[PDB]
């Protein structure tokens, strides 16, 4: 298992514009297009991201290219963030992937907001962090996914994703 496989499980793959859990226009493997309510605004961003007139539909190859860029960006966002970097550097490979997943989902700003949890992860207090991570809107809105990421931080293994 790796970050790509993990996120592919959590986000799925859709080749036509769709609405995410929050009602925002998205495509491919969780690539957010816009928070705007307009499908046209979404189609415009899509075309600009792909470089061609898509008409709201893309190919598998194109979805994977957006995905590669998005994972890369998440990683680079963590390394540039004063609050996240030190956490990321202190973690083992499985747990780093869990932090990337959260950033991919909610953005660097959002994750950096989890001050107390971050401090606990840094201290390697796994069970404590897991409980604190669960006291969040994130967990309440997307509990199944949140549980998978939380289990990864708690155990340091990929157990939550093997079977999926
Ligand atoms: Cl883009
Ligand atoms: Cl969920």
From Swiss-Prot:
Catalytic reactions of this protein: Hydrolysis of (1->4)-beta-linkages between N-acetylmuramic acid and N-acetyl-D-glucosamine residues in a peptidoglycan and between N-acetyl-D-glucosamine residues in chitodextrins
InterPro entries linked: Endolysin_T4_type, Glyco_hydro_24, Lysozyme-like_dom_sf, Lysozyme_dom_sf, Phage_lysozyme-like, T4-type_lysozyme
Chain segments annotated as transmembrane: none
Main location (coarse class): host cell
Gene Ontology annotations of biological process type: cell wall macromolecule catabolic process; defense response to bacterium; peptidoglycan catabolic process; viral release from host cell by cytolysis
E.C. number: 3.2.1.17
Gene induction: Expressed late in the viral replication.
Subcellular location: Host cytoplasm
GO MF annotation terms: lysozyme activity
Active site positions, chain numbering: 11, 20
Outcome of mutating residue 26 to E: Complete loss of activity at neutral pH; covalently bound substrate
Record annotation: effect of changing residue 117 to F: 10-fold decrease in enzymatic activity
The keyword Metal-binding is annotated on this UniProt entry: no
Effect annotated for changing residue 11 to N: Loss of 84% of enzymatic activity
Effect of residue 30 to F: Almost complete loss of enzymatic activity. The enzyme is destabilized by 1.5 kcal/mol
CDD domains: T4-like_lys
Activity at various pH: Optimum pH is 7.3.
Residues reported to bind substrate: 32, 104, 117, 132
GO CC terms: host cell cytoplasm
Annotated consequence of substituting residue 11 to A/F/H/M/N: Complete loss of enzymatic activity
UniProt KW keywords: Antimicrobial, Bacteriolytic enzyme, Cytolysis, Glycosidase, Host cell lysis by virus, Host cytoplasm, Hydrolase, Viral release from host cell
Effect seen on changing residue 117 to V: 50-fold decrease in enzymatic activity
Entry similarity comment: Belongs to the glycosyl hydrolase 24 family.
Stated role: Endolysin with lysozyme activity that degrades host peptidoglycans and participates with the holin and spanin proteins in the sequential events which lead to the programmed host cell lysis releasing the mature viral particles. Once the holin has permeabilized the host cell membrane, the endolysin can reach the periplasm and break down the peptidoglycan layer.
The name this protein goes by in its record: Endolysin
Organism of this sequence: Enterobacteria phage T4
């Amino acid at each position: 298992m790796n970050i790509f496989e993990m996120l592919r499980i959590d986000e799925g793959l859709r080749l036509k514009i769709y609405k995410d859990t929050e009602g925002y226009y998205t495509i491919g493997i969780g690539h957010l297009l816009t928070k705007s309510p307009s499908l046209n605004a979404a189609k415009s961003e899509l075309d600009k991201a792909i470089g061609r007139n898509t008409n709201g539909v893309i190919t598998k190859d194109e979805a994977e290219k957006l995905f590669n860029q998005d994972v890369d960006a998440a990683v680079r966002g963590i390394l540039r963030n004063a609050k996240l970097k030190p956490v990321y550097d202190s973690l083992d490979a499985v747990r780093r992937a869990a932090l990337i997943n959260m950033v991919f989902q909610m953005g660097e700003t959002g994750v950096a907001g989890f001050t107390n949890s971050l401090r606990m992860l840094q201290q390697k207090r796994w069970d404590e962090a897991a409980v604190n991570l669960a006291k969040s809107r994130w967990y309440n809105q997307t509990p199944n996914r949140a549980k998978r990421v939380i289990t990864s931080f708690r155990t340091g293994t990929w157990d939550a994703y093997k079977n999926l």
